[PDB]
Design a protein around this ligand. Structure first.
Ligand SMILES: COc1ccc(N2C(=O)CS[C@H]2c2cccc(Br)c2)c(OC)c1
Lengths: 195, 341, 166, 173, 138, 277, 399
């Protein structure tokens, strides 16, 4: 299976066959922990809160860690942020001031799925996994897709697994099924979330 | 007899054998165990391990083990190691939130309805020294709200968001012996679908098995109460309520049902097996801004003493943070016209 | 005239529709969301209903396992009420974060919309929330008339104070 | 910060914890004999108008204890001297006010007991009672050839004003 | 690349929900009892055989108006009487219809607010709850 | 403040502070001030050549030409005499004040300097008032484009003089409120009959005076009792501040409604928050 | 930039400074108050602001701009009607506006401000500047800096309270702001008190005034207290000034000698314990502290650019005193890092410039004159499509 390990350092999609790993297939993504904390900062600014990059990082890490999550259907996560107040949660800063967080809860992690949002070139963890697996002997495929294990502090975002399973189910229906809907029902992807 | 443990809802509760302690989830990610000292309640335990909101608790009387299901998709079995409780992770193999749990009468296994649209059945294998589970999947097309084992630790009632009340078989041969015939049927292989209500309305908030297990009743969101008699060809009797939906139900005798819910007060229904016809027995909570004991919706009701056969004391809890305790006899003396069974 | 029968009918329905509970998502690992909003699980959504007073006034109630969405169509006979109602509704929506059962934008075809979730019915006597929405339908029409008189009351004082200095 | 004394010598005798600082004077007392122009009593009078305004004063030397004593006393003279009518008259008021025995360390009434050490026996109690009155006398008169305007019968209102202010909010009274 | 997302893979997810879908009162007997000063009969007339299953809107819309027409043709001090000559099944259906007539405001939405009031005393708040829960309405 | 002041505070307070310093005998301060006034007016106050003892106050009106063609220059000289001088490069009119040669009672030169802007308009009204007071009819009408997109049309007749503004309410909203105010004006003769009859017209003028969703034609009608010399000055002080008065009040309403909506919503936030336990 | 200039409003604790941009000083400077009658008819309009409102007979005098308790929008809105249609006589629909806001002003307020400016007044443009920053820009004028920047420690001291504020590249390191319970009001009371214990015959009412007048006419910051008292007690003629006022009652003239208080007043800034039991920390320490609770990497660029701002920074030699004090603290520190080993000397520099009294309004005047201002400024259209939300962020510009 493939260990999609991502922490405060960097993202890695390292495949593993029967024995050990196959380095020729393991890839990297330039979007880890620190990279999502910042995009949050730069996101809380456009909202009315100016935190000092080199002095509030630690305080914004916790904010992310505490209220950040992976949206599933971004088009629907937007109507919730714009059309209603259900995503808005309060958060007390160390000095006592009480701020708010909303859309920027799911937007900050969305970088993993759209690197450009933080001006970085790639295709984003999901569209990266799909490629790392098609780049393997078709007869070693079924295994991988059936076995994708998430590890690393940056993989615990609420809804992360359900997104991948949707991203992949998307990349498949198009780039491996050429858009034939009547056969997606056969695509089985098991992304486990080992505690 | 009301007592408030808090103003936030009580998620679920589960008393021990003696009824000397009560375990509750204070809308929290944990379970609080209260013991009684005199006429004062006193928290004695804090079960912390879940990483999500606890959705169900069940206490195994004789073995004295607690089982809890969270939204973190996990389930833990709590064992009292002398002074404090240690949990043990039980992998239910699901991808959504656990929604409710129940230990089987034999305490050899527990069920776990869930969002993955599948019930889970777990048992311990002293061979490898850990729990394991098999899933009852079809024909479950939605989230599973409530569960209630049959006295024989094999049949299982289930109410789900797809509008159906169903009886299954959780027959796990690896821990119990072949099941004996039941009016529900003689064919009882694992996951077998014995019964299924025929309604397309209301979600099934709660399901209950009779004392002798040949009668099952459930409450739907269409403000109806239902009872299916296994000794009448599984013929189902239905009562169209005139108030808000009930979320909980239990038998207090073989022909008596007590259900609480969004009207915040417990009521009584009586099944007349003769005509296979349910009927409204009246309100049992009789006299913020409410004239009911509980202030918010009552969401769980259990039998405290006298089993479902001849219940003497039952208890209810709701979203108002309050836990009540009723006396079936006292209520009969307060209402002349209260005709139980 | 036709006001009490209208509100009393909307009060009933607001009572029927406001029975809900916490519900994790079937669709997303560890997400909780107003099902009447996202709408990705039809079985969890109740039938939408409408209470109408005349051809212009009406309420829209859309229930769900864990949330209700109420949309009111306020009264407006002339153009001054129309802009008054409009500036007023937008005034509140802009402050929706403090008026937590209020929805930032209306629902196509309605002047204002509430979004009551289980976390609300959990933290507040739901029989009151049903009062407050009826108390709102009552107070927003009274306020729109005060404003309408306020404007005229001053439109005249302002014309006489000028026209009299010649 | 507040003004500290600089008379601390690598070998200055000590009465209790207070520095037994040399002074030039003709009153009797254990006070040594000064050879230099100014003494701790001058230094105290020079810094008074400043120090008096301070609530907090750090004791750095056994020397500051004295400076603090003299200062507190100075405000005592301005209390008295505030109501009189001549350099000749005050020259006498500062005689009595200087002979009277104000509460010393260890005694109830002498503020700052947490800073000053009580005499460790009857001898010290007599020495320290002497080396204090001696200072109340010298610092006593010296305050006159200052407070009073060259035009007698005039207590310079440029000292009269600090009568209502207490150093470190403490008072020998 | 941001093209593969334009498609909703959830549509075809085999683990989704779908109802088990698959015929209207007889005008004659309705208009017949109506035009005969027998409104309490007309009501029972319409309320018979609701198109609860007709997958068509044109059809369900037909019975809607027949009932809609029977309710509007009622006197003030006349509704209640005929509301009480209906079993819970009846009331529950009426209340279903009353919320249909609420979608065609027609100079009628004030008379319905009268019906609703009566049917509410008889059917209770539960008859409204069942209108919101029905997965097969008119 | 219901009516808008006519005197321009920065002009008066800037001069007054310079004269005051001149009288007291202090060494003169350098002064450079840019600022404006309603209807696209721009002002400048400076020391020509860097002569800190001389203070100029020039005004700029894009529509000066139109005014000039009606008596502006003439009237401006009668009023400011020797204080008037050659207009600064950028402005149409300039007043100069020697800090060494100030009158006895400065209070009236300061008062008239603040009336600068108003004085350039006084011309065109005083003109047509005369025509009427003589019977000289048929005279064409003045057409001042006081705003990029607004015009005032003055013109006399036998027994009445008519001023006609053609203003524009930006926000589609303001048009609505506006009509309320104008309705009261067209009925003002019920509280003061010896007052200017007023008329109104929506989107279309009563040439090619633009027609638009956001355009209106207020038409005052002055009578002798207002156009004569006994009145004249007062009538001009009002009539020329009108257009700005109307918008001033249409905005003051909106701000009032806000204070309402504030307290009303604070009410709602109370009932609401009392459903909590 | 069009033919008209942008309006610049700087609402402070006790004084609202306003005027048009480009000018080097505010056309008006008034008390941040408004008086009303305490509404049917047009009573909302029946009010007054600034000076014309300090003692209005049948009127109530408010002060809606306070570092202490909740803000009044009904009032703030009116106070702006006159700031616009009476003082600046500016057609709002034709000028862009530059308003200021205190540090930590919540994003919600901005939306309110903007709800007013755009919906009530219809300004076609708006930009919300942050005081502490403009004051930094205002210091570029200083001939002590020929190198711009928006990174520094702004020590603002008005009449109400003093704020030591750090700024890294145009952004207020909010989490490091420190307040000091010492400002004009305190220096006054203190001087007032020092006079009661010495002078005689000062009209109990005009008591405060004589003080406020002494403070503004003879007060200054000295290098040393013993040496100052010395000077005064020696060459008494050279220093003791004289004041004479007019008894508002017996319309008689009263005279007094202005003495010690001249230097003793501003001294409470460096020895707060002199007149405030609770506080005691010398303004120089507070500033040391604030830069220490700041990103190590940006401390030096904060020590070399301490920008004074506010009327109470004016006392002759305020900066010379602040800077010597700060340097002694900071240097003594690094001296022990050697007595425990020798670092690299820290460059402490306090900046004084001609525009300090109204630094904030100056910087906002200059910046609203540049073309770059009309760009990083939210417009009408932007508001009628994205709404209030936009005014939550205001792009820093200048550097
Ligand atoms: C205490 O009352 C006030 C409340 C808010 C503010 N402001 C803001 O919140 C945004 S900028 C400033 C302000 C300044 C002038 C007018 C208006 Br409206 C608003 C304000 O100016 C500091 C004062």
């Amino acid at each position: 299976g493939v260990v999609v390990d991502s922490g405060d350092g960097v993202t890695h999609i390292c495949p593993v066959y029967e024995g050990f790993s196959l380095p020729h297939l393991t890839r990297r993504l330039d979007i880890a922990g620190r990279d999502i904390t910042r995009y949050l900062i730069k996101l809380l600014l456009l909202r009315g809160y100016a935190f000092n990059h080199s002095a509030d990082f630690e305080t914004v890490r916790m904010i992310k860690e505490k209220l950040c999550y992976v949206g599933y259907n971004i088009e629907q996560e937007q109507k919730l942020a714009l059309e209603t107040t259900v995503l808005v949660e309060s958060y007390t800063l160390p000095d006592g001031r009480i701020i708010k967080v909303g859309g920027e809860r799911f937007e900050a992690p969305e970088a993993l799925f759209q690197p450009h949002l933080i001006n970085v070139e790639g295709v984003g963890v999901a569209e990266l996994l799909f490629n790392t697996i098609q780049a393997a002997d078709i007869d070693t495929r079924s295994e991988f897709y059936k076995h994708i294990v998430l590890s690393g502090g940056s993989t615990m975002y609420p809804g992360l697994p359900s997104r991948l399973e949707r991203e992949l189910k998307q990349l498949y229906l198009e780039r491996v099924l050429k858009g034939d809907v009547e056969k997606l029902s056969k695509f089985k992807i098991r992304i486990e979330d080992p505690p | 007899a009301y007592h408030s443990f808090l103003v936030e809802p009580i998620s679920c509760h589960a008393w021990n054998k003696d009824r000397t302690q009560i375990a509750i989830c204070p809308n929290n990610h944990e379970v609080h165990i209260y013991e009684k000292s005199g006429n004062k309640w006193v928290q004695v335990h804090e079960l912390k391990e879940h990483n999500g909101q606890v959705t169900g608790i069940d206490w195994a009387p004789d073995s004295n083990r607690i089982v809890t299901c969270g939204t973190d998709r996990n389930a833990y079995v709590w064992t009292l190691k002398g002074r404090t409780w240690k949990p043990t992770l039980v992998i239910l193999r699901i991808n959504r939130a656990a929604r409710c749990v129940r230990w089987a009468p034999n305490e050899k296994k527990f069920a776990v309805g869930s969002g993955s649209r599948v019930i889970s059945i777990c048992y311990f294998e002293q061979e490898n020294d850990w729990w394991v589970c098999k899933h009852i999947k079809k024909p479950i097309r939605s989230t599973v709200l409530s569960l209630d084992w049959h006295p024989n630790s094999v049949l299982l009632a289930a109410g789900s968001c797809d509008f159906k009340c169903r009886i299954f078989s959780a027959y796990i041969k690896e821990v119990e012996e072949r099941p004996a015939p039941t009016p529900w049927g003689s064919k009882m292989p694992f996951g077998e679908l014995m019964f299924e209500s025929s309604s397309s309305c209301g979600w099934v908030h709660g399901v209950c098995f009779s004392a002798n297990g040949s009668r099952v009743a459930w409450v739907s969101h269409d403000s109806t109460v239902c009872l299916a008699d296994a000794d009448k060809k599984m013929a189902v009797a239905t009562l169209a309520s005139e108030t808000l939906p009930l979320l909980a139900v239990t038998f207090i005798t073989e022909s008596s049902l007590v259900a609480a819910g969004h009207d915040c007060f417990p009521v009584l229904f009586t099944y007349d097996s003769a005509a296979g016809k349910l009927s409204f027995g009246g309100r049992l909570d009789v006299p913020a801004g409410l004239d009911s004991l509980h202030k918010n919706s009552v969401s769980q009701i259990s039998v405290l003493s006298g089993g479902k056969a001849k219940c003497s004391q039952f208890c209810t809890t709701g979203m108002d943070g309050g836990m009540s305790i009723w006396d079936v006899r006292s209520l009969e003396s307060a209402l002349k016209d209260l005709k139980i069974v | 005239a036709t006001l009490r029968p209208y509100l009393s009918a909307v009060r009933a329905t607001l009572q029927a529709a406001l029975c809900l509970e916490n519900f994790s998502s079937q669709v997303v690992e560890r997400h909780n969301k107003p099902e009447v909003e996202v709408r990705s699980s039809k079985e969890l959504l109740l039938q939408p209903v409408t209470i109408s007073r005349n051809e212009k006034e009406k309420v829209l109630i859309e229930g769900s396992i864990n949330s209700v969405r109420v949309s009111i169509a306020v009264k407006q006979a002339d153009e001054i009420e129309k802009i008054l109602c409009h500036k007023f509704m937008r005034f509140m929506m802009m402050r929706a974060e403090n008026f937590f059962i209020l929805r930032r934008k209306p629902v196509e075809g309605y002047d204002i919309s509430f979004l009551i979730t289980n976390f609300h019915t959990e933290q507040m006597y739901k029989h009151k929330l049903v009062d407050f929405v009826i108390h709102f339908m009552e107070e927003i029409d009274k306020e729109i008339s005060e404003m309408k008189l306020s404007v005229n009351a001053r439109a005249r004082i302002v014309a006489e104070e000028f026209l009299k200095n010649f | 910060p507040a003004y500290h004394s600089s008379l601390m010598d690598p070998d200055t005798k000590l009465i209790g914890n207070m520095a037994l600082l040399p002074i030039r004077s003709q009153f009797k007392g254990p006070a040594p004999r000064e050879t230099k122009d100014t003494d701790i009593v001058d230094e105290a009078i020079y810094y008074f108008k400043a120090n008096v305004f301070f609530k907090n004063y750090e004791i750095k030397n056994e020397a500051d204890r004295t400076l603090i004593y003299i200062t507190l006393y100075i405000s005592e003279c301005l209390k008295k001297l505030q109501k009189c009518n001549s350099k000749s008259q005050g020259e006498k008021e500062m005689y009595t006010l200087g002979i009277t025995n104000f509460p010393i360390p260890g005694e109830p009434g002498f503020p700052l007991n947490a800073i000053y050490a009580k005499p460790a026996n009857k001898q010290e109690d007599e020495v320290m009672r002497a080396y204090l009155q001696q200072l109340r006398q010298e610092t006593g008169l010296r305050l006159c050839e200052k407070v009073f305007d060259p035009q007698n019968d005039k207590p310079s209102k440029w000292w009269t004003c600090f009568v209502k202010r207490q150093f470190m909010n403490k008072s020998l009274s | 690349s941001a093209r593969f997302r334009k498609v909703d893979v959830g549509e075809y997810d085999e683990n989704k929900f779908v109802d088990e879908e698959d015929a209207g009162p007889d005008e004659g007997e309705v208009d017949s009892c109506l035009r005969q000063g027998n409104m309490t009969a007309a009501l029972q007339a319409a309320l018979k055989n609701p198109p609860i299953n007709t997958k068509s809107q044109a059809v369900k819309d037909r019975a809607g108006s027949i009932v809609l027409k029977v309710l509007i043709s009622f006197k003030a001090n006349d509704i209640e009487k005929a509301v009480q000559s209906l079993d819970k099944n009846g009331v529950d259906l009426l209340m279903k219809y009353i919320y249909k007539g609420f979608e065609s405001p027609s100079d009628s939405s004030a008379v319905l607010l009268q019906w609703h009031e009566k049917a509410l005393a008889a059917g209770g708040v539960g008859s409204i709850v069942r209108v919101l829960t029905a997965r097969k309405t008119v | 403040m219901i009516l808008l002041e006519v005197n321009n505070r920065i002009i008066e307070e800037t001069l007054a502070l310079k004269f005051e310093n001149a009288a007291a005998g202090n060494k003169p301060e350098a002064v450079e001030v840019t600022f404006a006034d309603f209807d696209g007016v721009l002002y400048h106050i400076s020391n020509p050549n860097g002569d800190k003892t001389k203070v100029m106050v020039s005004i700029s009106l894009k529509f000066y030409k139109e005014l000039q063609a009606h008596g502006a220059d003439e009237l401006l000289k009668r009023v400011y005499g020797s204080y008037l001088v050659n207009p600064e490069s950028g402005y149409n009119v300039s007043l100069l004040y020697d800090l060494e040669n100030l009158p006895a009672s400065k209070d009236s030169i300061v008062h008239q300097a603040g009336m600068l802007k108003r004085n350039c308009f006084a011309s065109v009204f005083e003109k047509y008032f005369q025509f009427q007071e003589e019977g000289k009819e048929g005279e064409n009408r003045a057409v001042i484009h006081y705003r990029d997109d607004e015009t005032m049309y003055v013109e006399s007749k036998k027994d009445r003089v008519t001023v006609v503004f053609s203003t524009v309410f930006k926000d589609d909203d303001d048009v609505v409120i506006g009509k309320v105010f104008m309705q009261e004006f067209k009925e003002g003769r019920r509280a003061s009959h010896t007052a200017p009859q007023v008329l109104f017209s929506h989107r279309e003028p009563p040439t090619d005076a633009a027609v638009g969703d956001n355009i209106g034609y207020i038409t005052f009608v002055l009578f002798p009792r207002h156009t004569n010399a006994s009145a004249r000055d007062n009538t001009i002080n009002l009539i020329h501040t009108f257009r700005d008065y109307l918008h001033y009040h249409i905005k003051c309403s909106k701000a009032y409604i806000h204070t309402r909506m504030r307290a009303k919503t604070s009410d709602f936030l109370k009932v609401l928050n009392r459903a909590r336990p | 930039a069009g033919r008209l200039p942008a309006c610049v409003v700087d609402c402070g604790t006790g004084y609202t400074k306003l005027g048009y941009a480009g000018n080097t000083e505010p056309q008006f400077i008034i008390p941040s108050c408004i008086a009303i009658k305490e509404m049917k008819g047009v009573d909302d309009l029946d009010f007054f602001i600034g000076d014309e409102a300090i003692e209005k007979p049948t009127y109530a005098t408010k002060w809606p701009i306070r570092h202490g308790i909740v803000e009044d929008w009904d009032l703030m809105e009116r106070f702006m009607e006159q700031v616009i249609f009476k003082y600046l006589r500016a057609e709002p629909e034709d000028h862009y506006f530059l308003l200021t806001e205190p540090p930590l002003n919540t994003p919600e307020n901005r939306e309110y401000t903007a709800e007013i400016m755009f919906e009530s007044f219809n300004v076609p443009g708006l930009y919300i500047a942050v005081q502490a920053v403009l004051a930094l820009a205002a210091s570029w004028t200083s001939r002590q800096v020929g190198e711009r920047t928006l990174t520094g420690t702004v020590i603002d001291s008005g009449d109400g309270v003093t704020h030591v504020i750090p700024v890294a590249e145009g952004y207020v390191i909010g989490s490091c702001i420190k307040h000091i319970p010492i400002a004009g009001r305190d220096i006054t009371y203190f001087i007032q008190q020092l006079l009661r214990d010495r002078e005689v015959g000062i009209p109990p009412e005009q008591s405060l005034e004589t003080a406020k007048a002494v403070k503004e006419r003879y007060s200054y910051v000295c290098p040393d207290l013993v040496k100052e008292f010395n000077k005064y007690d020696t060459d008494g003629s050279k220093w003791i000034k004289q004041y004479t006022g007019i008894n508002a009652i017996s319309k008689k003239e009263f005279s007094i000698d202005v003495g010690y208080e001249r230097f003793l007043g501003p001294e409470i800034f460096f020895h707060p314990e002199f007149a405030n039991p609770d506080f005691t920390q010398p303004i120089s320490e507070v500033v040391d502290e604030v830069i220490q609770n700041c990103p190590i990497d940006v401390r030096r660029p904060l020590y070399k650019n301490i920008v004074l701002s506010g009327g109470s920074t004016m006392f002759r030699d305020f900066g010379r005193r602040l800077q010597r004090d700060l340097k002694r603290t900071v240097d003594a520190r690094l001296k022990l890092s050697e007595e425990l080993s020798k670092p690299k000397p820290i460059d402490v520099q306090v900046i004084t410039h001609h525009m300090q009294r109204y630094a904030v309004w100056f910087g906002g005047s200059m910046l609203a004159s540049t073309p770059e201002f009309y760009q990083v400024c939210h417009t009408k259209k932007d508001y009628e499509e994205i709404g209030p939300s936009i005014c939550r962020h205001n792009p820093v510009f200048g550097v």
